[PDB]
PDB file of C-alpha atoms and ligand atoms in Angstrom:
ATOM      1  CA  UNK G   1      85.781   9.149 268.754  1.00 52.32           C
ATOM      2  CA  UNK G   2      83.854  12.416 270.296  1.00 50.62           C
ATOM      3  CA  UNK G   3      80.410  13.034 271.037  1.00 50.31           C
ATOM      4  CA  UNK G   4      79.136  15.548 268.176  1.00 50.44           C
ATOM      5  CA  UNK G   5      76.242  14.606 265.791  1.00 53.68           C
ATOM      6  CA  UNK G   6      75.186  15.773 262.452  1.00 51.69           C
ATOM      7  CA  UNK G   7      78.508  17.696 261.337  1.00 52.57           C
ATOM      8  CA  UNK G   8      79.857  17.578 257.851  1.00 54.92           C
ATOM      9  CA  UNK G   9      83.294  16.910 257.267  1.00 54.41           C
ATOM     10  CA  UNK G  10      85.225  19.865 255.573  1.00 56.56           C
ATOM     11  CA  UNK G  11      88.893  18.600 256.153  1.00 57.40           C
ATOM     12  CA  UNK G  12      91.160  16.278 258.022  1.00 58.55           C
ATOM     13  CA  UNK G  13      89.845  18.231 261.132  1.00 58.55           C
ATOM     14  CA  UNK G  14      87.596  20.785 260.744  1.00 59.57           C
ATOM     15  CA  UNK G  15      83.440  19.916 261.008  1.00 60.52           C
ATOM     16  CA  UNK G  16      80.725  22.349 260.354  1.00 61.46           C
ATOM     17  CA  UNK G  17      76.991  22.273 260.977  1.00 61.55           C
ATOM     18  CA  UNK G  18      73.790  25.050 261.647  1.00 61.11           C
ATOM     19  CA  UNK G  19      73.250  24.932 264.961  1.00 58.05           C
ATOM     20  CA  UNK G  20      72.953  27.064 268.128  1.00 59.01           C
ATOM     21  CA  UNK G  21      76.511  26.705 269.760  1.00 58.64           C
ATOM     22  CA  UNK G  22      74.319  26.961 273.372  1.00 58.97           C
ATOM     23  CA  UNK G  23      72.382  24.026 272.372  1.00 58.67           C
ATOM     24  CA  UNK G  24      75.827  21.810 271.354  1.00 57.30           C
ATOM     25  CA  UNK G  25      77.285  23.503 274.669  1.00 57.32           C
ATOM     26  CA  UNK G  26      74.275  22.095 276.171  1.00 53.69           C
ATOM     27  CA  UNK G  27      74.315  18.667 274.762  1.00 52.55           C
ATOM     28  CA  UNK G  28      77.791  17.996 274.149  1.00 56.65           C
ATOM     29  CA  UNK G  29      79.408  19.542 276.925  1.00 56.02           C
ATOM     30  CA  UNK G  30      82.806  19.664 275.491  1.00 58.90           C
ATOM     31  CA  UNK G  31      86.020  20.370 276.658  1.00 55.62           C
ATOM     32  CA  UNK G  32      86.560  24.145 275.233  1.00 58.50           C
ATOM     33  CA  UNK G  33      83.741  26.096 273.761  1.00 58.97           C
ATOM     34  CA  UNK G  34      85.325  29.324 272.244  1.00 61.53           C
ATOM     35  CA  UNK G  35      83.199  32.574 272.408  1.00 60.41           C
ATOM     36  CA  UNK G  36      83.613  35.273 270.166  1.00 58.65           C
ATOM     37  CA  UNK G  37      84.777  38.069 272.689  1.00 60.31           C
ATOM     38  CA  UNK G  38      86.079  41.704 272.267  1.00 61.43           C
ATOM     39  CA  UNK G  39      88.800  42.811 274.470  1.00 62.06           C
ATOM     40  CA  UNK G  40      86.845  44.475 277.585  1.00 62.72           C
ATOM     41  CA  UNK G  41      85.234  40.581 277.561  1.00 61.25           C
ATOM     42  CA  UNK G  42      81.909  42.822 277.396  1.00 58.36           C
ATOM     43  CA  UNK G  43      79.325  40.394 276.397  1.00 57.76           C
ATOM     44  CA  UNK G  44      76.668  42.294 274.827  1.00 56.80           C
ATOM     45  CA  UNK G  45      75.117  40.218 271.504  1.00 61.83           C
ATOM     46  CA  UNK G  46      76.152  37.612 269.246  1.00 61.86           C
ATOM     47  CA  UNK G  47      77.777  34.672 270.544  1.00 59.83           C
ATOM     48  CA  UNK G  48      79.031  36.380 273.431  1.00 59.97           C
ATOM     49  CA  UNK G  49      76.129  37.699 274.553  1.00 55.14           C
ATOM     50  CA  UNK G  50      74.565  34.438 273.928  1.00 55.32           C
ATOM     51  CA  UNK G  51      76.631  32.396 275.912  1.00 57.64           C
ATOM     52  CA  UNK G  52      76.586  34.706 278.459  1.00 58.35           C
ATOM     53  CA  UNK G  53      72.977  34.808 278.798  1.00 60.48           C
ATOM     54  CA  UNK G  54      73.036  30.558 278.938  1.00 57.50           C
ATOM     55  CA  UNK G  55      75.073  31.330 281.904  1.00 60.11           C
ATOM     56  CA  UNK G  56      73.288  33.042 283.914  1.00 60.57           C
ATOM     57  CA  UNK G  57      75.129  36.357 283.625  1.00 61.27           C
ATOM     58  CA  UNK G  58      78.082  34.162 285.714  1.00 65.66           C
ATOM     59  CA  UNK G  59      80.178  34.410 282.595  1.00 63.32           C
ATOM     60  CA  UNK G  60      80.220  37.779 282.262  1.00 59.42           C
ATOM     61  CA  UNK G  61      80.773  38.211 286.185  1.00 57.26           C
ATOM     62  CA  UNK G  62      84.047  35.880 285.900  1.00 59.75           C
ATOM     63  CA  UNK G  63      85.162  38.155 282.841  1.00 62.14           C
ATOM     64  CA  UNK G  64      84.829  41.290 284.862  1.00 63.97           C
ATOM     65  CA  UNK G  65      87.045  39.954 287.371  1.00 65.04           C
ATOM     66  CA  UNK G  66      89.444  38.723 284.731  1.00 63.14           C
ATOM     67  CA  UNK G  67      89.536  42.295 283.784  1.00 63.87           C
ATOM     68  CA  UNK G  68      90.098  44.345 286.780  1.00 61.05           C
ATOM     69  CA  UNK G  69      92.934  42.212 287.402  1.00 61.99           C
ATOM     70  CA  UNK G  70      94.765  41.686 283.763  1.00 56.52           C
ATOM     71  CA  UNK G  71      93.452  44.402 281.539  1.00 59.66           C
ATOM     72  CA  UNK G  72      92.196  44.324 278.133  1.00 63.42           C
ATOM     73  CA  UNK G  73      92.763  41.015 275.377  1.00 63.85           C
ATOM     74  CA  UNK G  74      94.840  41.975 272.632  1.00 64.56           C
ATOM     75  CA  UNK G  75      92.784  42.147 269.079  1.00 64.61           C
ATOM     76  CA  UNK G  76      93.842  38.637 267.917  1.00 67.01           C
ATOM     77  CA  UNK G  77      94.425  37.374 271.683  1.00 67.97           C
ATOM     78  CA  UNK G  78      92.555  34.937 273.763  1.00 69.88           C
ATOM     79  CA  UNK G  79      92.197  33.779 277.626  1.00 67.05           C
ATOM     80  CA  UNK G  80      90.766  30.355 279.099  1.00 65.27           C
ATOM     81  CA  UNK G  81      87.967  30.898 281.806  1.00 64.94           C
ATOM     82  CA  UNK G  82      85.464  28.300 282.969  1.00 66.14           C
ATOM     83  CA  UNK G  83      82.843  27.838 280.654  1.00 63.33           C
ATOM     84  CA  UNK G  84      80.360  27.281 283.467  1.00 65.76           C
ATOM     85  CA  UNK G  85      77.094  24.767 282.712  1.00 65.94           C
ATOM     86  CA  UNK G  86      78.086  24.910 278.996  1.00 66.76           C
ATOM     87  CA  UNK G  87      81.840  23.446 279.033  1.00 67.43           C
ATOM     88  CA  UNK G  88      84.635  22.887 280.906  1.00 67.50           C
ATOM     89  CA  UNK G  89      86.642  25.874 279.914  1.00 63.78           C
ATOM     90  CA  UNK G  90      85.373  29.189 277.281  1.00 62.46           C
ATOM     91  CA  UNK G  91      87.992  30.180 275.451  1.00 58.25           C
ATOM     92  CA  UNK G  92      87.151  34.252 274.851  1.00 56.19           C
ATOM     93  CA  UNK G  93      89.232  34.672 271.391  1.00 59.24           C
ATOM     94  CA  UNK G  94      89.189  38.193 270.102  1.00 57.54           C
ATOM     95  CA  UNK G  95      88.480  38.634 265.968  1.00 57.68           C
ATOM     96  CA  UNK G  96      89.086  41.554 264.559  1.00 59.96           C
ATOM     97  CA  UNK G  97      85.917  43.549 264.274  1.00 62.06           C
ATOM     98  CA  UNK G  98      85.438  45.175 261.070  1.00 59.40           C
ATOM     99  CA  UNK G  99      82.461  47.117 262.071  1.00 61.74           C
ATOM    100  CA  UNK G 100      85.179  48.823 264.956  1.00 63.17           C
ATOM    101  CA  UNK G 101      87.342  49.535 262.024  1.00 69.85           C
ATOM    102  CA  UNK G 102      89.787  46.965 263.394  1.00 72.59           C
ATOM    103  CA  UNK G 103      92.200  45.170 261.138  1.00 71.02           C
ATOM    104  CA  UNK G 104      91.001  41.799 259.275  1.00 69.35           C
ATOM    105  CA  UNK G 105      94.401  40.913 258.496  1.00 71.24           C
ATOM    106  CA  UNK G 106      94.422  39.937 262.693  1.00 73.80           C
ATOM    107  CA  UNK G 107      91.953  36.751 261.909  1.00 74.06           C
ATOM    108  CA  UNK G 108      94.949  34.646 261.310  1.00 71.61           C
ATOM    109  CA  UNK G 109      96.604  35.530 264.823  1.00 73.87           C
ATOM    110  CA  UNK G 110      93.267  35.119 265.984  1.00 76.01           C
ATOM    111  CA  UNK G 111      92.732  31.508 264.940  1.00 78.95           C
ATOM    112  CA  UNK G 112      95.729  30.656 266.136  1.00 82.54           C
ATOM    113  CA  UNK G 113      94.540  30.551 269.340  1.00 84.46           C
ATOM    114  CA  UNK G 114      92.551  27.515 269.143  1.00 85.30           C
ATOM    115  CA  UNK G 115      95.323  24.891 268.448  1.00 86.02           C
ATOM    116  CA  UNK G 116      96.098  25.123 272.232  1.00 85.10           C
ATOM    117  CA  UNK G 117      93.587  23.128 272.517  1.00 88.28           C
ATOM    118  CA  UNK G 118      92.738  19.119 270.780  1.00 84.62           C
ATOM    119  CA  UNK G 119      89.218  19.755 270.490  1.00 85.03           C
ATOM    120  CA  UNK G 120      86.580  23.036 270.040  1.00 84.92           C
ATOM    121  CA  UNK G 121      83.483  23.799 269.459  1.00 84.38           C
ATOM    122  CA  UNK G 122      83.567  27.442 267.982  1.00 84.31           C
ATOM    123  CA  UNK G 123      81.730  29.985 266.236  1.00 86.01           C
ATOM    124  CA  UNK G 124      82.843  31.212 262.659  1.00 83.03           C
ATOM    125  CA  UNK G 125      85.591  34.216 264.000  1.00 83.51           C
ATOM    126  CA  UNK G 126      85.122  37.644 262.430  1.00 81.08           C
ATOM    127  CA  UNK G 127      81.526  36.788 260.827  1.00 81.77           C
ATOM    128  CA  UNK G 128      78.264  37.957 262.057  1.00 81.92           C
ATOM    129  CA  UNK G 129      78.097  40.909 263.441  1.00 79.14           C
ATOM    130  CA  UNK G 130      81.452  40.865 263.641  1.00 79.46           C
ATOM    131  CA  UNK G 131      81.481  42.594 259.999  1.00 78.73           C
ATOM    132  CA  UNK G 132      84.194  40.040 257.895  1.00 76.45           C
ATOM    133  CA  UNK G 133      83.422  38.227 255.348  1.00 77.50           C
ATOM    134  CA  UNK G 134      82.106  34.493 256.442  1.00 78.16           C
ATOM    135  CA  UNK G 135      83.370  32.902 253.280  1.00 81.49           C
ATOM    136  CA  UNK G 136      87.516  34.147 253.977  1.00 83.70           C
ATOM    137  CA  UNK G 137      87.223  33.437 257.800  1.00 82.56           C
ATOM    138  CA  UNK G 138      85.971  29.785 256.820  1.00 83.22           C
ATOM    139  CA  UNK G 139      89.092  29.547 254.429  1.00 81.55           C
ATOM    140  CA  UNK G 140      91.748  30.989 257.451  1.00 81.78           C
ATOM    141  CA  UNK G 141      90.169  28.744 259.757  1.00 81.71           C
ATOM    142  CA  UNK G 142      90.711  25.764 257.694  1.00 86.41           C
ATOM    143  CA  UNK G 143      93.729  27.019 256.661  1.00 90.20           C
ATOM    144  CA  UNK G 144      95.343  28.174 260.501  1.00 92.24           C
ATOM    145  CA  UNK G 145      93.940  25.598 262.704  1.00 92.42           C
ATOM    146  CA  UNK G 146      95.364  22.293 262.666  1.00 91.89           C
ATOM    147  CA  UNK G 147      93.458  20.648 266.043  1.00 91.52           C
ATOM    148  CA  UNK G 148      90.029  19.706 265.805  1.00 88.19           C
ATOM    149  CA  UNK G 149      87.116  21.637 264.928  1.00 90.03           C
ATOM    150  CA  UNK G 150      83.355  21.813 265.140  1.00 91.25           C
ATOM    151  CA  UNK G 151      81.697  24.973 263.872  1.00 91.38           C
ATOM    152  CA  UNK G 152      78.367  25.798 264.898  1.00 90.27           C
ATOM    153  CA  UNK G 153      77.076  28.479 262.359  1.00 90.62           C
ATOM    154  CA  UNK G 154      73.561  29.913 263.906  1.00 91.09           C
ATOM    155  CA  UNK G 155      72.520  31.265 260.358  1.00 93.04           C
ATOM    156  CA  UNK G 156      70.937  29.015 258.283  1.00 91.01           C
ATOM    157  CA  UNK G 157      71.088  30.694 255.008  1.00 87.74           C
ATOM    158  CA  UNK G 158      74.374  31.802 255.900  1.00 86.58           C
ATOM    159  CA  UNK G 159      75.502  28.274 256.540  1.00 87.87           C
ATOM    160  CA  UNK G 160      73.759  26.851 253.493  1.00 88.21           C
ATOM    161  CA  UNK G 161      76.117  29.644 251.369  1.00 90.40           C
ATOM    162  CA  UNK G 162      79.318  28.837 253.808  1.00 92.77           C
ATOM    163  CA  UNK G 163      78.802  24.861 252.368  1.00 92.28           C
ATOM    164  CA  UNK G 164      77.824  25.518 248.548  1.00 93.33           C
ATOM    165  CA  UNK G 165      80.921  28.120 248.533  1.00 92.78           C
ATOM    166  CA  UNK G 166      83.411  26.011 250.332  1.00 93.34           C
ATOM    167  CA  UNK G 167      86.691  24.796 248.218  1.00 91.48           C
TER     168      UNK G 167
HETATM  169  O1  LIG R 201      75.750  33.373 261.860  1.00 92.12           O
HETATM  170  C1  LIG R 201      76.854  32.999 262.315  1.00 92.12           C
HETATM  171  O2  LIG R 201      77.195  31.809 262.499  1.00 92.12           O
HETATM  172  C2  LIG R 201      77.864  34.096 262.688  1.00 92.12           C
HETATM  173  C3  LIG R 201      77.570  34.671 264.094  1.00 92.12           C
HETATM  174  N1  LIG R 201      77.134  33.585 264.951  1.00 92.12           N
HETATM  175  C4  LIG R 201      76.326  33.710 266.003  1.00 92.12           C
HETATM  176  O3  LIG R 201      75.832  34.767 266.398  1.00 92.12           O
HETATM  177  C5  LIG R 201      76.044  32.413 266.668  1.00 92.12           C
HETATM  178  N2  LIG R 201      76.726  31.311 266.267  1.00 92.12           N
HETATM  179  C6  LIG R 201      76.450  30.147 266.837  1.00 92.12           C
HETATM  180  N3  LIG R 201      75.576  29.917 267.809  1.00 92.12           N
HETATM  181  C7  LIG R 201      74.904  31.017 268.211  1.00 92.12           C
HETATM  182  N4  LIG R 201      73.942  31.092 269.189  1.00 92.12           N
HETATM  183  C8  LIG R 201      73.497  32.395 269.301  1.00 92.12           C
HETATM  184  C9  LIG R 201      74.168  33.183 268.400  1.00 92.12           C
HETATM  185  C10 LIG R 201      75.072  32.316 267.692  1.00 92.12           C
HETATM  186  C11 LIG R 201      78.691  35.459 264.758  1.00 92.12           C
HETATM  187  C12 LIG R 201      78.386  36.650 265.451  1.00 92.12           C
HETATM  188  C13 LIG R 201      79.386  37.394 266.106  1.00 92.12           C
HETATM  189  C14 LIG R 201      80.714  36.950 266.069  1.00 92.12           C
HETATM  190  C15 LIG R 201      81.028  35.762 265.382  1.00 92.12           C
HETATM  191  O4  LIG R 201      82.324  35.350 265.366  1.00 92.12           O
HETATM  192  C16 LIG R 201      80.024  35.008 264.737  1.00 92.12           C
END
């Protein structure tokens, strides 16, 4: 038994609801939140810059260490650094980014990433501003990740067309 509320059950693991993943940061506090990063961890908008702004600007000062010392993600890679007031650890997974012209066939590889870990909460990879289609990175996820799941989607109309559309 965990500690999030309100989420509809999609399959054996995965758990959706609209939501602000700050605010179930904030109130859950759970072991891994994942942010939506790009390589250069440059958190600008979306999630990323989101989170980052929660933070304080501390997670983006953390990343820019990360950086100087290791380099750029790989599209499809991931690193664990804290996650500061809003989890224990962030885990800064890198979907492909369709409005970079980057390759959507990498949102597999990408979701990978998360079962190293039992439990997430996670933004929808890929979607957004990220350029993919929301309704085939719902589908990978559910169909790549095999540990537990809770997705916050911030969009409510987007979320309300993610449930009706789900198989
Ligand atoms: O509309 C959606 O869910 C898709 C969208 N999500 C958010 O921007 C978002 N999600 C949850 N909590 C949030 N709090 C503040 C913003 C925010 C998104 C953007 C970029 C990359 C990505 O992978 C997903």
């Amino acid at each position: 038994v965990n500690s999030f509320s309100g989420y509809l059950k999609l399959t054996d693991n995965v758990y959706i609801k609209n939501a602000d993943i700050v605010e179930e940061a904030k109130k859950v506090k759970p072991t891994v939140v994942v942010n939506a990063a790009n390589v250069y961890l440059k958190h600008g908008g979306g999630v990323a810059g989101a989170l980052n702004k929660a933070t304080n600007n501390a997670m983006q000062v953390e990343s820019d260490d990360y950086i100087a010392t290791n380099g750029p993600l790989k599209v499809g890679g991931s690193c664990v650094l804290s996650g500061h007031n809003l989890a224990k650890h962030c885990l800064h997974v890198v979907g492909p980014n369709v409005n970079k012209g980057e390759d959507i066939q990498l949102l597999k590889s990408a979701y990978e990433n998360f079962n190293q870990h039992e439990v997430l909460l996670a933004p929808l990879l890929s979607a957004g501003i990220f350029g993919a289609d929301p309704i085939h990175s719902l589908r990978v996820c559910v169909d790549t990740v095999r540990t537990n799941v809770y997705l916050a989607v911030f969009d409510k109309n987007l979320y309300d067309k993610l449930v009706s559309s789900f198989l």
